[PDB]
Amino acid sequence: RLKQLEXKVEXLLSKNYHLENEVARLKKLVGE
Amino acid sequence: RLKQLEXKVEXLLSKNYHLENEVARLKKLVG
């Protein structure tokens, strides 16, 4: 169970970083 | 440990939902 939870943290973090990159890219687009 | 990890998963699910909302908002603005 611990390892499954650990894998979920890693997956969510990776997903989070992709969403942060996306947001930063979109902000360059608008000018904010 | 299980409780802290369960708490990190929830904390991260929440940031991701907030980030998905920003992406959607910025896309409306662009557009």
UniProtKB/Swiss-Prot annotation, chain A:
Homodimer. Each subunit binds overlapping and non-identical half-sites that flank the central CG base-pair in the pseudo-palindromic motif 5'-ATGA[CG]TCAT-3'. Interacts with the mediator tail; the interaction with GAL11/MED15 is direct. Interacts with the SAGA histone acetyltransferase complex. Interacts with the SWI/SNF chromatin remodeling complex. Residues 5-26 are annotated as: Leucine-zipper. Residues 89 to 100 and 106 to 125 define the N-terminal activation domain (NTAD) and the central acidic activation domain (CAAD) respectively, which can function independently to promote high-level transcription of the target genes. The chain holds residues 249 to 280 of 281 of the full protein. Disruption phenotype: Abolishes recruitment of the mediator complex to the upstream activating sequence (UAS) of amino-acid starvation responsive genes. Decreases RNA level of genes involved in amino acid biosynthesis and cofactor biosynthesis during amino acid starvation or methyl methanesulfonate stress. Growth dependent on amino acid supplementation. Sensitive to amino acid starvation. Sensitive to purine starvation. Decreases cellular glycogen levels during glucose starvation. Phosphorylated by the cyclin-CDK PCL5-PHO85. The gene is GCN4. Belongs to the bZIP family. GCN4 subfamily. This is General control transcription factor GCN4.
